[PDB]
Symmetry: none
Subunit: 187 residues, 2 copies
Amino acid sequence: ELWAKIANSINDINEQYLKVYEHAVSSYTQMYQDFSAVLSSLAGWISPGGNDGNSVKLQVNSLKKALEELKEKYKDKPLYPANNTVSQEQANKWLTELGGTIGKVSQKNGGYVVSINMTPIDNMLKSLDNLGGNGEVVLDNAKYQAWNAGFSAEDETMKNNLQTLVQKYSNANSIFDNLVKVLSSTI
Amino acid sequence: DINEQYLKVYEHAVSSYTQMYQDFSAVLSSLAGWISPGGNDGNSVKLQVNSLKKALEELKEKYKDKPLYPANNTVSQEQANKWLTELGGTIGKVSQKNGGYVVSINMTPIDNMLKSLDNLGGNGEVVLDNAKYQAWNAGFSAEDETMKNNLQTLVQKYSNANSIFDNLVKV
Protein backbone atom coordinates (compact mmCIF):
# COMPACT_ATOMS: atom_id res chain seq x y z
CA GLU A 1 0.00 0.00 0.00
CA LEU A 2 2.30 2.73 1.31
CA TRP A 3 5.30 0.44 1.11
CA ALA A 4 5.11 0.74 -2.66
CA LYS A 5 6.53 4.19 -2.00
CA ILE A 6 9.41 2.58 -0.11
CA ALA A 7 9.95 0.02 -2.86
CA ASN A 8 10.19 2.85 -5.38
CA SER A 9 12.50 4.98 -3.25
CA ILE A 10 14.86 2.06 -2.59
CA ASN A 11 14.93 1.09 -6.25
CA ASP A 12 15.77 4.69 -7.22
CA ILE A 13 18.67 4.80 -4.74
CA ASN A 14 19.87 1.52 -6.26
CA GLU A 15 19.66 3.12 -9.70
CA GLN A 16 21.30 6.44 -8.92
CA TYR A 17 23.88 5.27 -6.41
CA LEU A 18 24.70 1.55 -6.23
CA LYS A 19 24.39 0.76 -9.95
CA VAL A 20 26.77 3.64 -10.73
CA TYR A 21 29.35 2.09 -8.42
CA GLU A 22 28.81 -1.36 -9.93
CA HIS A 23 29.42 0.02 -13.42
CA ALA A 24 32.51 2.01 -12.43
CA VAL A 25 34.09 -1.11 -10.83
CA SER A 26 33.26 -3.20 -13.89
CA SER A 27 34.80 -0.67 -16.33
CA TYR A 28 37.97 -0.19 -14.30
CA THR A 29 38.37 -3.92 -13.70
CA GLN A 30 38.15 -4.57 -17.44
CA MET A 31 40.86 -1.97 -18.05
CA TYR A 32 43.04 -3.47 -15.29
CA GLN A 33 42.64 -7.01 -16.75
CA ASP A 34 43.87 -5.67 -20.09
CA PHE A 35 46.74 -3.82 -18.34
CA SER A 36 47.64 -7.07 -16.49
CA ALA A 37 47.84 -8.75 -19.92
CA VAL A 38 50.45 -6.15 -20.92
CA LEU A 39 52.39 -6.83 -17.71
CA SER A 40 52.22 -10.56 -18.40
CA SER A 41 53.85 -9.93 -21.78
CA LEU A 42 56.72 -7.83 -20.43
CA ALA A 43 59.01 -10.66 -19.28
CA GLY A 44 59.04 -11.89 -22.90
CA TRP A 45 60.12 -8.41 -24.08
CA ILE A 46 63.13 -8.51 -21.76
CA SER A 47 66.36 -10.43 -22.42
CA PRO A 48 69.98 -10.33 -21.28
CA GLY A 49 72.23 -7.67 -22.81
CA GLY A 50 75.65 -8.64 -24.17
CA ASN A 51 79.32 -7.58 -23.84
CA ASP A 52 79.36 -8.69 -20.76
CA GLY A 53 77.64 -9.08 -18.52
CA ASN A 54 75.54 -6.53 -16.57
CA SER A 55 72.89 -5.29 -19.10
CA VAL A 56 69.27 -5.62 -20.31
CA LYS A 57 67.72 -5.65 -23.78
CA LEU A 58 64.17 -4.22 -23.92
CA GLN A 59 61.72 -4.44 -26.87
CA VAL A 60 60.55 -0.91 -26.09
CA ASN A 61 58.56 -0.90 -29.38
CA SER A 62 56.45 -3.94 -28.55
CA LEU A 63 55.79 -2.46 -25.10
CA LYS A 64 54.83 0.96 -26.49
CA LYS A 65 52.39 -0.56 -28.97
CA ALA A 66 50.72 -2.62 -26.23
CA LEU A 67 50.33 0.45 -23.99
CA GLU A 68 49.03 2.57 -26.87
CA GLU A 69 46.36 0.02 -27.78
CA LEU A 70 45.30 -0.20 -24.12
CA LYS A 71 44.76 3.55 -24.07
CA GLU A 72 42.78 3.56 -27.35
CA LYS A 73 40.51 0.73 -26.25
CA TYR A 74 39.48 2.64 -23.13
CA LYS A 75 39.01 6.10 -24.68
CA ASP A 76 35.24 5.89 -25.10
CA LYS A 77 34.62 3.55 -22.16
CA PRO A 78 33.66 5.76 -19.23
CA LEU A 79 33.54 4.89 -15.56
CA TYR A 80 30.28 6.89 -15.63
CA PRO A 81 27.73 7.01 -16.92
CA ALA A 82 27.12 3.64 -18.62
CA ASN A 83 24.96 5.21 -21.32
CA ASN A 84 24.65 8.66 -22.86
CA THR A 85 26.15 11.56 -20.90
CA VAL A 86 25.50 13.94 -17.99
CA SER A 87 26.13 17.57 -17.02
CA GLN A 88 29.56 18.96 -16.17
CA GLU A 89 28.50 19.45 -12.55
CA GLN A 90 26.97 15.98 -12.48
CA ALA A 91 30.28 14.43 -13.60
CA ASN A 92 32.26 16.42 -11.02
CA LYS A 93 30.15 15.18 -8.13
CA TRP A 94 30.77 11.59 -9.20
CA LEU A 95 34.45 12.34 -9.83
CA THR A 96 34.65 13.40 -6.16
CA GLU A 97 32.76 10.33 -4.99
CA LEU A 98 35.10 8.05 -6.95
CA GLY A 99 38.35 10.02 -6.62
CA GLY A 100 40.63 12.03 -8.94
CA THR A 101 43.14 9.17 -8.91
CA ILE A 102 40.62 6.81 -10.56
CA GLY A 103 38.70 9.11 -12.91
CA LYS A 104 38.85 12.15 -15.11
CA VAL A 105 35.97 14.45 -16.08
CA SER A 106 35.95 14.55 -19.88
CA GLN A 107 33.83 16.13 -22.61
CA LYS A 108 31.68 13.91 -24.86
CA ASN A 109 29.04 14.94 -27.40
CA GLY A 110 26.57 17.33 -25.77
CA GLY A 111 27.70 16.45 -22.25
CA TYR A 112 30.30 15.10 -19.84
CA VAL A 113 31.40 11.67 -18.58
CA VAL A 114 33.87 10.57 -15.93
CA SER A 115 36.45 8.70 -18.05
CA ILE A 116 39.17 6.36 -16.77
CA ASN A 117 42.21 8.38 -15.63
CA MET A 118 44.90 7.01 -17.97
CA THR A 119 47.68 9.17 -16.54
CA PRO A 120 49.71 6.21 -15.28
CA ILE A 121 49.77 4.86 -18.86
CA ASP A 122 50.58 8.34 -20.10
CA ASN A 123 53.54 8.39 -17.73
CA MET A 124 54.76 5.00 -18.99
CA LEU A 125 54.64 6.05 -22.62
CA LYS A 126 56.68 9.19 -21.89
CA SER A 127 59.57 7.34 -20.21
CA LEU A 128 59.67 4.86 -23.04
CA ASP A 129 60.10 7.77 -25.38
CA ASN A 130 63.16 9.01 -23.45
CA LEU A 131 65.15 5.67 -24.18
CA GLY A 132 65.48 6.36 -26.95
CA GLY A 133 63.26 4.31 -29.18
CA ASN A 134 62.22 1.63 -30.88
CA GLY A 135 62.62 -1.86 -29.46
CA GLU A 136 65.73 -3.35 -29.30
CA VAL A 137 67.29 -0.99 -26.80
CA VAL A 138 70.09 -2.08 -24.54
CA LEU A 139 70.18 -0.55 -21.10
CA ASP A 140 73.00 -0.78 -18.58
CA ASN A 141 71.97 -1.99 -15.11
CA ALA A 142 71.60 1.35 -13.36
CA LYS A 143 69.65 2.85 -16.30
CA TYR A 144 67.25 -0.09 -16.50
CA GLN A 145 66.79 -0.10 -12.73
CA ALA A 146 65.92 3.60 -12.95
CA TRP A 147 63.44 3.21 -15.79
CA ASN A 148 61.90 0.30 -13.88
CA ALA A 149 61.43 2.08 -10.54
CA GLY A 150 59.24 4.58 -12.41
CA PHE A 151 57.31 1.96 -14.44
CA SER A 152 56.65 -0.15 -11.31
CA ALA A 153 55.38 2.96 -9.59
CA GLU A 154 52.75 3.31 -12.29
CA ASP A 155 51.79 -0.38 -12.21
CA GLU A 156 51.34 -0.31 -8.42
CA THR A 157 49.34 2.91 -8.62
CA MET A 158 46.77 1.34 -10.94
CA LYS A 159 46.67 -1.73 -8.69
CA ASN A 160 45.99 0.44 -5.65
CA ASN A 161 43.28 2.31 -7.52
CA LEU A 162 41.38 -0.91 -8.34
CA GLN A 163 41.69 -2.22 -4.76
CA THR A 164 40.43 1.06 -3.26
CA LEU A 165 37.59 1.35 -5.80
CA VAL A 166 36.46 -2.12 -4.73
CA GLN A 167 36.73 -1.27 -1.03
CA LYS A 168 34.73 1.90 -1.69
CA TYR A 169 32.12 -0.11 -3.58
CA SER A 170 32.11 -2.59 -0.72
CA ASN A 171 31.23 0.38 1.48
CA ALA A 172 28.40 1.63 -0.77
CA ASN A 173 26.88 -1.86 -0.55
CA SER A 174 26.78 -1.60 3.26
CA ILE A 175 25.47 1.96 3.15
CA PHE A 176 22.65 0.91 0.82
CA ASP A 177 21.61 -2.18 2.79
CA ASN A 178 21.60 0.02 5.89
CA LEU A 179 19.25 2.55 4.25
CA VAL A 180 17.12 -0.29 2.89
CA LYS A 181 16.55 -1.23 6.53
CA VAL A 182 15.93 2.31 7.79
CA LEU A 183 13.20 2.66 5.18
CA SER A 184 11.55 -0.69 5.82
CA SER A 185 11.39 0.34 9.48
CA THR A 186 8.87 2.98 8.47
CA ILE A 187 6.49 0.02 8.30
CA ASP B 1 12.95 -7.43 -9.62
CA ILE B 2 15.02 -9.91 -7.71
CA ASN B 3 13.72 -13.42 -7.21
CA GLU B 4 14.32 -16.39 -4.97
CA GLN B 5 15.77 -17.78 -8.17
CA TYR B 6 17.93 -14.80 -9.07
CA LEU B 7 19.69 -15.53 -5.77
CA LYS B 8 20.13 -19.22 -6.57
CA VAL B 9 22.10 -18.06 -9.62
CA TYR B 10 24.31 -15.67 -7.64
CA GLU B 11 24.96 -18.15 -4.81
CA HIS B 12 26.18 -20.81 -7.23
CA ALA B 13 28.37 -18.33 -9.15
CA VAL B 14 29.87 -17.06 -5.90
CA SER B 15 30.51 -20.62 -4.72
CA SER B 16 32.16 -21.65 -8.00
CA TYR B 17 34.55 -18.67 -8.28
CA THR B 18 35.38 -18.88 -4.55
CA GLN B 19 36.37 -22.52 -4.90
CA MET B 20 38.46 -21.75 -7.98
CA TYR B 21 40.31 -19.00 -6.12
CA GLN B 22 40.92 -21.26 -3.09
CA ASP B 23 42.55 -23.75 -5.41
CA PHE B 24 44.62 -20.95 -6.94
CA SER B 25 45.73 -19.98 -3.43
CA ALA B 26 46.95 -23.55 -2.93
CA VAL B 27 49.21 -22.82 -5.88
CA LEU B 28 50.43 -19.64 -4.15
CA SER B 29 51.26 -21.86 -1.13
CA SER B 30 53.71 -23.81 -3.31
CA LEU B 31 55.27 -20.89 -5.14
CA ALA B 32 58.17 -19.90 -2.87
CA GLY B 33 59.17 -23.53 -2.90
CA TRP B 34 59.51 -23.35 -6.71
CA ILE B 35 61.84 -20.37 -6.40
CA SER B 36 65.51 -20.73 -5.40
CA PRO B 37 69.00 -19.22 -5.52
CA GLY B 38 70.14 -19.87 -9.12
CA GLY B 39 73.17 -18.97 -11.26
CA ASN B 40 75.35 -20.10 -9.97
CA ASP B 41 77.45 -17.05 -10.76
CA GLY B 42 75.59 -13.75 -10.64
CA ASN B 43 72.44 -12.20 -9.29
CA SER B 44 69.64 -14.60 -10.25
CA VAL B 45 66.93 -17.02 -9.18
CA LYS B 46 65.76 -20.34 -10.57
CA LEU B 47 62.08 -20.97 -11.18
CA GLN B 48 60.56 -24.43 -11.54
CA VAL B 49 58.51 -23.35 -14.56
CA ASN B 50 57.41 -26.92 -15.24
CA SER B 51 55.92 -27.50 -11.75
CA LEU B 52 54.04 -24.17 -11.71
CA LYS B 53 52.72 -24.66 -15.29
CA LYS B 54 51.44 -28.08 -14.28
CA ALA B 55 49.61 -26.68 -11.27
CA LEU B 56 48.00 -23.93 -13.37
CA GLU B 57 46.98 -26.22 -16.25
CA GLU B 58 45.37 -28.53 -13.66
CA LEU B 59 43.38 -25.70 -12.11
CA LYS B 60 42.12 -24.77 -15.59
CA GLU B 61 41.22 -28.41 -16.36
CA LYS B 62 39.30 -28.70 -13.12
CA TYR B 63 36.99 -25.73 -13.68
CA LYS B 64 36.60 -26.19 -17.44
CA ASP B 65 33.16 -27.74 -16.94
CA LYS B 66 32.14 -25.90 -13.79
CA PRO B 67 30.36 -22.81 -15.12
CA LEU B 68 29.16 -19.87 -13.04
CA TYR B 69 25.77 -20.08 -14.82
CA PRO B 70 23.84 -22.14 -15.19
CA ALA B 71 24.83 -24.84 -12.71
CA ASN B 72 22.93 -27.58 -14.51
CA ASN B 73 21.67 -26.86 -18.07
CA THR B 74 22.45 -24.48 -20.99
CA VAL B 75 20.86 -21.33 -22.44
CA SER B 76 20.74 -19.12 -25.53
CA GLN B 77 23.69 -16.92 -26.38
CA GLU B 78 21.56 -13.85 -25.71
CA GLN B 79 20.48 -15.08 -22.28
CA ALA B 80 24.05 -16.07 -21.33
CA ASN B 81 25.29 -12.63 -22.46
CA LYS B 82 22.60 -11.09 -20.29
CA TRP B 83 23.84 -12.85 -17.17
CA LEU B 84 27.47 -12.10 -18.05
CA THR B 85 26.53 -8.42 -17.99
CA GLU B 86 24.61 -8.91 -14.77
CA LEU B 87 27.57 -10.50 -12.94
CA GLY B 88 30.06 -7.69 -13.56
CA GLY B 89 31.10 -8.91 -17.01
CA THR B 90 34.74 -9.56 -16.02
CA ILE B 91 34.36 -12.67 -13.85
CA GLY B 92 32.75 -14.81 -16.56
CA LYS B 93 33.02 -15.64 -20.24
CA VAL B 94 30.23 -16.83 -22.57
CA SER B 95 31.15 -20.23 -23.97
CA GLN B 96 29.52 -22.99 -26.01
CA LYS B 97 28.24 -26.03 -24.14
CA ASN B 98 26.49 -28.97 -25.83
CA GLY B 99 23.53 -27.43 -27.65
CA GLY B 100 23.54 -23.94 -26.09
CA TYR B 101 25.65 -21.55 -24.00
CA VAL B 102 26.86 -20.99 -20.47
CA VAL B 103 28.69 -18.30 -18.51
CA SER B 104 32.03 -20.01 -17.77
CA ILE B 105 34.54 -18.83 -15.14
CA ASN B 106 36.84 -16.35 -16.95
CA MET B 107 40.21 -18.12 -16.96
CA THR B 108 41.97 -15.38 -18.92
CA PRO B 109 44.20 -14.46 -15.91
CA ILE B 110 45.42 -18.08 -15.70
CA ASP B 111 45.95 -18.31 -19.50
CA ASN B 112 48.01 -15.13 -19.34
CA MET B 113 50.07 -16.58 -16.50
CA LEU B 114 50.62 -19.64 -18.67
CA LYS B 115 51.62 -17.64 -21.74
CA SER B 116 54.12 -15.69 -19.69
CA LEU B 117 55.65 -18.92 -18.41
CA ASP B 118 56.08 -19.90 -22.08
CA ASN B 119 57.88 -16.60 -22.70
CA LEU B 120 60.29 -18.11 -20.19
CA GLY B 121 61.45 -20.70 -22.71
CA GLY B 122 62.71 -23.85 -21.01
CA ASN B 123 59.95 -26.34 -20.30
CA GLY B 124 62.19 -27.00 -17.31
CA GLU B 125 63.97 -24.79 -14.83
CA VAL B 126 64.69 -21.27 -16.01
CA VAL B 127 67.19 -18.82 -14.55
CA LEU B 128 65.92 -15.27 -14.11
CA ASP B 129 68.07 -12.23 -13.44
CA ASN B 130 66.56 -9.33 -11.48
CA ALA B 131 65.06 -7.54 -14.50
CA LYS B 132 63.36 -10.63 -15.83
CA TYR B 133 62.22 -11.90 -12.40
CA GLN B 134 60.68 -8.54 -11.49
CA ALA B 135 58.91 -8.42 -14.86
CA TRP B 136 57.54 -11.97 -14.43
CA ASN B 137 56.36 -11.29 -10.87
CA ALA B 138 54.69 -7.95 -11.75
CA GLY B 139 52.61 -9.73 -14.39
CA PHE B 140 51.79 -12.81 -12.28
CA SER B 141 50.77 -10.75 -9.28
CA ALA B 142 48.65 -8.46 -11.46
CA GLU B 143 46.70 -11.47 -12.84
CA ASP B 144 46.27 -12.69 -9.24
CA GLU B 145 44.90 -9.26 -8.20
CA THR B 146 42.44 -9.39 -11.09
CA MET B 147 40.93 -12.64 -9.72
CA LYS B 148 40.97 -11.42 -6.13
CA ASN B 149 39.11 -8.22 -6.97
CA ASN B 150 36.65 -10.13 -9.21
CA LEU B 151 35.81 -12.38 -6.22
CA GLN B 152 35.36 -9.50 -3.78
CA THR B 153 33.06 -7.65 -6.19
CA LEU B 154 30.85 -10.66 -6.86
CA VAL B 155 30.65 -11.41 -3.14
CA GLN B 156 29.49 -7.83 -2.56
CA LYS B 157 26.87 -8.21 -5.31
CA TYR B 158 25.56 -11.39 -3.69
CA SER B 159 25.47 -9.76 -0.25
CA ASN B 160 23.41 -6.88 -1.62
CA ALA B 161 20.92 -9.11 -3.46
CA ASN B 162 20.48 -11.20 -0.32
CA SER B 163 19.85 -8.10 1.80
CA ILE B 164 17.24 -6.67 -0.52
CA PHE B 165 15.55 -10.10 -0.49
CA ASP B 166 15.48 -10.58 3.27
CA ASN B 167 13.92 -7.17 3.81
CA LEU B 168 11.44 -6.97 0.87
CA VAL B 169 10.14 -10.47 1.65
CA LYS B 170 9.87 -9.96 5.31
CA VAL B 171 7.86 -6.80 4.72
